[PDB]
């Protein structure tokens, strides 16, 4: 058995020891047994078969990534969303559009929104410093 890490830019998706894996490499399906010679390749979006030590199979869905096989370790640098050129270009076009037309979205923090509104209303017309003769 060998140690395997499946990690995204955001979170660790898997860890531990494994017996083997099967991956749909970019240039064709592929299977990594222990001692496999060092290898580096991209992988297509789809399931990656694991069989954990003692034969426990499971499937993890990967949206794509890069697979790096080292002398004794293997790590899959999965990513969070489908990547290509047709997509990333649309993302960049919208990122420019939102900058040209000054489009600003709200955050989603309802807690800070309510607290800030209560804090602004409580401090209004307070006039305390005119009243306690704090020189300032």
């Amino acid at each position: 058995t060998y140690h395997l890490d499946v990690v995204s830019a955001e979170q660790q998706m898997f860890s531990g020891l494994v017996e083997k894996i099967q991956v749909t490499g970019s240039e064709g399906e592929l299977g990594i047994y222990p001692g496999h010679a060092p290898l580096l390749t991209a992988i297509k979006p789809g399931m990656i078969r694991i069989v954990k030590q003692h034969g426990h199979e499971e499937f993890i869905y990967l949206s794509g990534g890069i697979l790096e096989v080292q002398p004794g370790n293997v790590t899959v640098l999965a990513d969070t969303a489908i990547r290509g050129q047709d997509l990333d270009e649309a993302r960049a076009m919208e990122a420019k559009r939102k900058a040209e037309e000054h489009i600003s979205s709200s955050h989603g923090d309802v807690d800070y929104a309510q607290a800030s509104a209560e804090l602004a209303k409580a401090i209004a017309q307070l006039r305390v410093i005119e009243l306690t003769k704090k020189a300032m």
């Binding site: 309802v110 807690d111 309510q114 607290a115 209560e118």
Partner: protein, 171 residues
């Protein structure tokens, strides 16, 4: 004995005093307004067996007598620190504070924990109630500040989620 309003007795005494030209005091209440409620509420007492035997000249021997009093006071805008309310709070053995923000919210009776207390306490409570009600008051006093923290905090720790849900059951 229940005094339905000792605020209105204080007002009537102020009237019938000013009409006799007697010098007034703070908030125009007569000088001895404290003695008015004091010499009244100090009659509410528990009296031991020897006083009862002596008073009634031996006709009753084993008994002890008592007279409990529940005077009612009215506060403007919840201001406990007015003159008459803070006089009477210094004469009695406790207070039940009925909070309007609870009454209008449908919590009835609107007893306010924390700010209400009984200074004789468990000594007067029956044994089963004393045993089963030990934690309720402070539990609610703390729950009602936790519920004031809750408005601004979503995503609450389960440890406090339990406390909030339990306090809400009991409330």
């Amino acid at each position: 004995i229940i005094y339905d309003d000792l605020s209105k007795q204080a007002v009537a005494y102020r009237q019938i005093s000013l009409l006799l030209r007697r010098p007034p005091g703070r908030e125009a209440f007569p000088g001895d307004v404290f003695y008015l409620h004091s010499r009244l509420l100090e009659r509410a007492a528990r009296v031991n067996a020897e006083y009862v035997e002596a008073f009634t000249k031996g006709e009753v021997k084993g008994k002890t007598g008592s007279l409990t009093a529940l005077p009612i006071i009215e506060t403007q805008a919840g201001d406990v620190s007015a003159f008459v309310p803070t006089n009477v709070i210094s004469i009695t053995d406790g207070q039940i504070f009925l909070e309007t923000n609870l009454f209008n919210a449908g919590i009835r009776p609107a007893v306010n924990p924390g700010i209400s207390v009984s200074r004789v306490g468990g000594a007067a409570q029956t044994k089963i109630m004393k045993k089963l009600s030990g934690g309720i008051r402070t539990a609610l006093a703390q729950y009602r500040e936790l519920a004031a923290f809750s408005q601004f905090a979503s995503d609450l720790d389960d440890a406090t989620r339990k406390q909030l849900d339990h306090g809400q059951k009991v409330t």
